[PDB]
Amino acid sequence: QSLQTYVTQQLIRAAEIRASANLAATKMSECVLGQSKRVDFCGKGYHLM
Amino acid sequence: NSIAIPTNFTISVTTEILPVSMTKTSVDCTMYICGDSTECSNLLLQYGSFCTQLNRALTGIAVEQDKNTQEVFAQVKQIYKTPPIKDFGGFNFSQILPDPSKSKRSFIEDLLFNKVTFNGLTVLPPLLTDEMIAQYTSALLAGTITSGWTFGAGAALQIPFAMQMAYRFNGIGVTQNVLYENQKLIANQFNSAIGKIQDSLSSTASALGKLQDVVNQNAQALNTLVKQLSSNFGAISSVLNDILSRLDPPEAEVQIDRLITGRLQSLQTYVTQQLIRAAEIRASANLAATKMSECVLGQSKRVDFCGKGYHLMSFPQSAPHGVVFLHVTYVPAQEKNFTTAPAICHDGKAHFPREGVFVSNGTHWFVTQRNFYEPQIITTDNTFVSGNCDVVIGIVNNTVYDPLQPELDS
Amino acid sequence: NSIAIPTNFTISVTTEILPVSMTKTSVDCTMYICGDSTECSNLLLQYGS
Amino acid sequence: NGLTVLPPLLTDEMIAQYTSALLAGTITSGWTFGAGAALQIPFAMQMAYRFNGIGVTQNVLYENQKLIANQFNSAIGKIQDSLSSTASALGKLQDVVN
Amino acid sequence: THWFVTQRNFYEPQIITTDNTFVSGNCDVVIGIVNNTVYDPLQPELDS
Amino acid sequence: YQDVNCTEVNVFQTRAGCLIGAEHVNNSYECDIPIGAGICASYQTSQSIIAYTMSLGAENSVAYSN
Numbered sequence: 170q171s172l173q174t175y176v177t178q179q180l181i182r183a184a185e186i187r188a189s190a191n192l193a194a195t196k197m198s199e200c201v202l203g204q205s206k207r208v209d210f211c212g213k214g215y216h217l218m
Numbered sequence: 219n220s221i222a223i224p225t226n227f228t229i230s231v232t233t234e235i236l237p238v239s240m241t242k243t244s245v246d247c248t249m250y251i252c253g254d255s256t257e258c259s260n261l262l263l264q265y266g267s268f269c270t271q272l273n274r275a276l277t278g279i280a281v282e283q284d285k286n287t288q289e290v291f292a293q294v295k296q297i298y299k300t301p302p303i304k305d306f307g308g309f310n311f312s313q314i315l316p317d318p319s320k321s322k323r324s325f326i327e328d329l330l331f332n333k334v335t336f337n338g339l340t341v342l343p344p345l346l347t348d349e350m351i352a353q354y355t356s357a358l359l360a361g362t363i364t365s366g367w368t369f370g371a372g373a374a375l376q377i378p379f380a381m382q383m384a385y386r387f388n389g390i391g392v393t394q395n396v397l398y399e400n401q402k403l404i405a406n407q408f409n410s411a412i413g414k415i416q417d418s419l420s421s422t423a424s425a426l427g428k429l430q431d432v433v434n435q436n437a438q439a440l441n442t443l444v445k446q447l448s449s450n451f452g453a454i455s456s457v458l459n460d461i462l463s464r465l466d467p468p469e470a471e472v473q474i475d476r477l478i479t480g481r482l483q484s485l486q487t488y489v490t491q492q493l494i495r496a497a498e499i500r501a502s503a504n505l506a507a508t509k510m511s512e513c514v515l516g517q518s519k520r521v522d523f524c525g526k527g528y529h530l531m532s533f534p535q536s537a538p539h540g541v542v543f544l545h546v547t548y549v550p551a552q553e554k555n556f557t558t559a560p561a562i563c564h565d566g567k568a569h570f571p572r573e574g575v576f577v578s579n580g581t582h583w584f585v586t587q588r589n590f591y592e593p594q595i596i597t598t599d600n601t602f603v604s605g606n607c608d609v610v611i612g613i614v615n616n617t618v619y620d621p622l623q624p625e626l627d628s
Numbered sequence: 629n630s631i632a633i634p635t636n637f638t639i640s641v642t643t644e645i646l647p648v649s650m651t652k653t654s655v656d657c658t659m660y661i662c663g664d665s666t667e668c669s670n671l672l673l674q675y676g677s
Numbered sequence: 678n679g680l681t682v683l684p685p686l687l688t689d690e691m692i693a694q695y696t697s698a699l700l701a702g703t704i705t706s707g708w709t710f711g712a713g714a715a716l717q718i719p720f721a722m723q724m725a726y727r728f729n730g731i732g733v734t735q736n737v738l739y740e741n742q743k744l745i746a747n748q749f750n751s752a753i754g755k756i757q758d759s760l761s762s763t764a765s766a767l768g769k770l771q772d773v774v775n
Numbered sequence: 776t777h778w779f780v781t782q783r784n785f786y787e788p789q790i791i792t793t794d795n796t797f798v799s800g801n802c803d804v805v806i807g808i809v810n811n812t813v814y815d816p817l818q819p820e821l822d823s
Numbered sequence: 824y825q826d827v828n829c830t831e832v833n834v835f836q837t838r839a840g841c842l843i844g845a846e847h848v849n850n851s852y853e854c855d856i857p858i859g860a861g862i863c864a865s866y867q868t869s870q871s872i873i874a875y876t877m878s879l880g881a882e883n884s885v886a887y888s889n
């Protein structure tokens with residue numbers, strides 16, 4: 170139960186990191202590789218690069 | 219002073235494959251833990267709500283697989299269908315519109331379904347049959363093909379496909395005469411790019427792997443759940459009937475309390491892992507539902523969201539437990555170097571391009587759209603003025619052509 | 629009857645930080661539960677998978 | 678005690694080679710390297726197309742390019758100071774480590 | 776018999792004119808092209 | 824009754840298993856109450872529970888011509 174508790178915490182924390190890796194992959198595709206027109210997605214003010 | 223501009227393009231089609239729903243597996247914790255064994259049932263009921271909260275939790279997962287399947291595919295208001303004559307401007311959808319000769323899946327959807335693989339357990343059927351996913355994806359296809367984005371935003375207003383692709387080209391900043399001057403080429407590029415998919419899904423297995431992983435994780439989770447019925451957990455036998463033959467109740471109820479503790483921990487393991495897996499698949503179903511609203515029902519400005527290259531349109535194809543998008547993209551090609559300047563000095567005024575970029579073939583100068591070299595003579599009808607030669611760094615001296623003065627001179 | 633129009637601009641360089649990867653920690657189930665004990669391992673195999 | 682830590686596939690030097698390539702793509706070739714080939718364009722003109730994409734006409738960069746270079750350079754220095762003085766910004770990474 | 780130009784998302788029939796049109800090349804390359812005049816907002820002014 | 828084989832005791836065999844107490848109709852509607860495998864049920868005219876294959880929407884030949 171000590172090990173299976175930790176694994177269940179890590180499977181949930183891994184999903185909270187996958188949700189964040191997908192957001193970082195999205196912000197790179199749109200806001201580095203491009204110029205997004207999506208308000209507040211890439212800083213306050215109008216996005217340049 | 220150096221810029222490179224494409225002289226040409228490749229329309230490319232790419233395949234994106236997304237999970238949408240697990241199998242709707244459900245497991246009676248009563249018949250899994252005990253099963254035709256009232257001496258066990260009388261013990262199990264003392265652990266209280268655990269089996270009720272497991273049945274409720276897997277029921278929540280099962281219902282959500284139909285919400286995911288609904289939210290991806292059931293976006294369309296009506297079941298659109300194509301006219302009999304396939305006069306789509308020479309673009310050819312034969313691989314992707316449904317075969318009336320068959321479920322009425324399309325050719326590419328059959329190649330998708332061809333490339334993907336008992337006690338207390340149950341498997342419920344999904345709410346939309348594969349034929350209903352094929353009718354919803356045919357509605358999404360024929361809506362997109364006959365009416366552009368408009369069926370995603372109101373009525374399915376018709377438009378000729380040669381002009382639908384002119385809006386899609388205009389939308390990526392490539393002036394729509396670039397389509398019309400090249401429409402026979404572009405149809406051949408599109409058609410042979412779907413041909414490469416019709417090959418790839420026939421010869422090669424790797425693409426469906428992202429749906430096959432949803433299957434393989436479930437089959438491994440159920441085999442692991444059933445093999446845990448055979449484990450001893452410190453009882454004298456893992457067979458429930460052995461204890462309910464070889465031992466009297468004063469010992470047998472302690473032996474069974476080892477088995478119940480074990481068979482209950484195997485269920486709490488599996489149901490927790492299926493709750494976590496359902497969250498992982500629901501995030502891919504919400505990504506699929508998003509890609510369908512934004513890339514099929516619209517045109518996406520979002521870089522590398524609907525493949526590499528500027529997004530023209532996209533087509534959904536059903537797949538077992540998932541969705542496949544044939545994303546269609548303008549990828550620029552055959553770039554050439556040119557000298558460039560931010561502006562020009564003509565009688566001391568600084569002239570800037572209205573939309574294009576200034577470029578030179580070593581000698582003379584032209585404006586062009588940025589995404590495709592189509593030089594036009596620098597007139598007042600393609601520039602605007604602001605200020606003078608002091609304020610701009612690297613302003614070139616070149617002539618601007620006044621388009622009134624030849625007419626007025628007559 | 630009135631609108632305000634900006635007479636100037638400020639370029640800003642807002643910073644944003646996102647987590648992407650966990651430490652790839654792996655724990656062996658037997659060496660954690662039992663250490664090197666052969667007797668504990670033979671009991672651990674009664675819990676199956 | 679049976680605990681082990683596997684290495685990441687990409688070393689932190691190889692991660693710096695990817696960020697370097699994404700910088701060089703973004704500085705020398707605008708958005709184009711996301712869509713296929715890196716079409717070079719001068720950076721003053723790239724920023725005029727970045728400006729034009731937000732409804733500020735290209736001359737409003739080109740008449741003010743010295744001011745805009747100085748504003749940008751100032752803002753980059755401020756990030757080095759802001760990262761140098763307090764770790765509190767990296768608190769979103771540090772929480773994941775903790 | 777006669778032709779108008781409009782924005783795409785709401786019917787507003789303007790005349791086809793040299794302000795709201797642009798040119799590229801001769802007819803034969805555009806599959807489905809039609810015949811019509813294009814009015815010129817300034818070419819009538821030779822007489823005045 | 825889920826998955827049971829429909830001589831295992833108005834009475835009918837869906838793909839989901841045996842449905843008792845609702846009439847199977849040679850028609851289709853929106854999916855009022857879900858059952859599964861494209862079958863749904865609803866309450867209709869003399870009133871009964873009716874069961875049917877769901878309908879995905881009005882068919883519409885968008886009047887495309889080139």
Ligand SMILES: *[C@@H]1O[C@H](CO)[C@@H](O[C@@H]2O[C@H](CO)[C@@H](O[C@@H]3O[C@H](CO)[C@@H](O)[C@H](O)[C@@H]3O)[C@H](O)[C@H]2NC(C)=O)[C@H](O)[C@H]1NC(C)=O
Binds near residue numbers: 579580581582
């Ligand atoms: C850069 O682009 C310009 C486009 O204007 C090129 O100049 C133009 O080239 C054509 C022929 O390619 C010239 O017309 C023809 O010239 C030949 C010369 O022997 C003559 O026999 C024909 O009767 C006809 O006049 C045209 O006059 C010329 N336009 C201008 C404004 O010079 C130019 O060649 C391109 N490349 C370079 C390296 O400059």
Ligand SMILES: *[C@@H]1O[C@H](CO)[C@@H](O[C@@H]2O[C@H](CO)[C@@H](O[C@@H]3O[C@H](CO)[C@@H](O)[C@H](O)[C@@H]3O)[C@H](O)[C@H]2NC(C)=O)[C@H](O)[C@H]1NC(C)=O
Binds near residue numbers: 607613614615
């Ligand atoms: C683009 O054309 C302009 C206008 O012709 C050029 O700038 C002007 O160049 C002339 C000489 O070619 C300069 O006049 C001279 O100035 C000196 C003092 O610096 C004076 O001693 C001479 O008697 C004569 O007046 C003029 O000042 C200059 N104007 C500006 C605004 O700089 C320019 O050189 C051309 N540039 C390119 C890239 O072709």
Ligand SMILES: *[C@@H]1O[C@H](CO)[C@@H](O[C@@H]2O[C@H](CO)[C@@H](O[C@@H]3O[C@H](CO)[C@@H](O)[C@H](O)[C@@H]3O)[C@H](O)[C@H]2NC(C)=O)[C@H](O)[C@H]1NC(C)=O
Binds near residue numbers: 636747748
């Ligand atoms: C548009 O806004 C920017 C700031 O976002 C202004 O930038 C800088 O503003 C300061 C005043 O707050 C200017 O300072 C003055 O500079 C001269 C020397 O250049 C000095 O002698 C004065 O005592 C005073 O400090 C600074 O020059 C200016 N930076 C630049 C590069 O122009 C800018 O002034 C605003 N635009 C307008 C039209 O004012």
Ligand SMILES: *[C@@H]1O[C@H](CO)[C@@H](O[C@@H]2O[C@H](CO)[C@@H](O)[C@H](O)[C@H]2NC(C)=O)[C@H](O)[C@H]1NC(C)=O
Binds near residue numbers: 304310311312313
């Ligand atoms: C659209 O594409 C299909 C192929 O997917 C073309 O169909 C082939 O056409 C030739 C010539 O008529 C036949 O010999 C083949 O047997 C057809 N089928 C296949 C699978 O190759 C079709 O010609 C294309 N054009 C149109 C307007 O439909």
Ligand SMILES: *[C@@H]1O[C@H](CO)[C@@H](O[C@@H]2O[C@H](CO)[C@@H](O)[C@H](O)[C@H]2NC(C)=O)[C@H](O)[C@H]1NC(C)=O
Binds near residue numbers: 228407
């Ligand atoms: C632009 O690219 C297309 C191919 O994507 C070129 O078309 C080919 O042209 C050669 C002759 O130059 C023919 O042999 C091929 O059959 C054509 N291919 C196709 C698919 O039609 C086109 O010539 C290129 N050049 C320009 C300036 O647009």
Ligand SMILES: *[C@@H]1O[C@H](CO)[C@@H](O[C@@H]2O[C@H](CO)[C@@H](O)[C@H](O)[C@H]2NC(C)=O)[C@H](O)[C@H]1NC(C)=O
Binds near residue numbers: 612
């Ligand atoms: C482009 O960069 C060059 C430097 O690489 C700028 O400077 C001029 O460069 C040319 C040779 O390319 C020299 O003949 C000039 O003498 C240089 N200028 C000075 C002040 O010495 C050049 O001005 C830049 N051009 C643009 C359009 O920005």
Ligand SMILES: *[C@@H]1O[C@H](CO)[C@@H](O[C@@H]2O[C@H](CO)[C@@H](O)[C@H](O)[C@H]2NC(C)=O)[C@H](O)[C@H]1NC(C)=O
Binds near residue numbers: 802808809810
């Ligand atoms: C638009 O009208 C012109 C005539 O005003 C058509 O051009 C003629 O087409 C015939 C076709 O057999 C040729 O014999 C003539 O030599 C053409 N005359 C000229 C001046 O080119 C033209 O074909 C019509 N275009 C369309 C698309 O209807």
Ligand SMILES: *[C@@H]1O[C@H](CO)[C@@H](O)[C@H](O)[C@H]1NC(C)=O
Binds near residue numbers: 307380807808889
């Ligand atoms: C439109 O349909 C008619 C049918 O006869 C055909 O002649 C014509 O070439 C088509 N036009 C285009 C632009 O596809």
Ligand SMILES: *[C@@H]1O[C@H](CO)[C@@H](O)[C@H](O)[C@H]1NC(C)=O
Binds near residue numbers: 828830
């Ligand atoms: C029971 O189910 C099988 C298919 O699983 C079917 O062949 C059989 O006819 C069913 N029994 C009855 C009574 O129809």
